[PDB]
């Protein structure tokens, strides 16, 4: 009656295509699967429908190929996340602080070749993160203007110039910015401009805090009403970026 069904193997497959039923004496030849290689090259792998209607005994014949081992790129590292360079395993590339990755971070062990295995991508490099000097602004000299390039985390501080005339400047934005990316700084070069707010006045209400001669940017003035009045607006104002009291001035209604 024969042997109708053949057992599937880990590392092998029938070389050609199978028919529904086999009769005794016939043989199925096996071959390494993709990504495998012979355990003992040359050794012919085949099942034989024996005369007892069973399939003969065939040991496992191939073994997972492996992509070449990989070295850590300079200033970085390669991670065998799967614990080997086996076929069907992936590696991750990462760079040390101060360094960015140039290339493809994840590489795959693939049977790109009809015969043989190779990584899907070449290894990246790790390039040091050097960003160019920040732009000077109006009356704004950054530190190390004389310097030509800043490495990672080098920090520049922005200096407002001396007064053009009577009233001095007030540096809007953040004075200190740092080199955090290969071509990136952390903050925009901050505007340095004379910011002064109008003296805060309130009918029936005294100025509790402040009294600064000139209320420059970020000055802060607390205000409260005179005896008998109930506050209606917000007690604390802040000299604004646009020289406007932020928020609006309070009122002191009966
Ligand atoms: C190998 O590791 C990666 C990352 O954890 C995971 O995505 C993948 O499934 C793993 N593959 C194997 C064969 O373990
Ligand atoms: C690898 O880099 C790509 C961009 O090249 C990014 O989209 C991806 O999230 C990164 N993955 C890892 C594990 O670093």
Residue numbers in the entry: 41 to 294
Excerpt from the publication:
Bovine CD46 (bovCD46) in particular is involved in bovine viral diarrhoea virus entry, an economically important disease in cattle industries. This study presents the X-ray crystallographic structure of the extracellular region of bovCD46, revealing a four-short-consensus-repeat (SCR) structure similar to that in human CD46. The structure revealed that the extracellular portion of bovCD46 adopted an extended conformation of 112Å in length. One of the two monomers in the asymmetric unit only had electron density for SCR1-3—this was likely due to the interdomain flexibility in the structure. There was a much-reduced angle between SCR3 and SCR4, leading to a bend in the structure, resulting in a hockey-stick-like appearance. An extension of the CD’ loop in SCR3 affected the SCR3–SCR4 domain interface. This loop contained an insertion of five hydrophobic residues causing it to adopt an extended conformation protruding from the bottom of the domain. The protrusion perturbed the head-to-tail domain interface found between the other SCRs in the protein and caused the bend between SCR3 and SCR4. However, SCR4, which contained the fifth predicted glycosylation site, was the least well-resolved part of the structure due to its flexibility and the fact that it was not stabilised by crystal contacts. The area of interaction with BVDV was identified as two peptides on SCR1, as seen in both bovCD46 structures; these form a single interaction interface. An intriguing feature of these two crystal structures was the crystallographic dimer formation, which was identical in both protein constructs, despite them varying in size, unit cell, and space group.
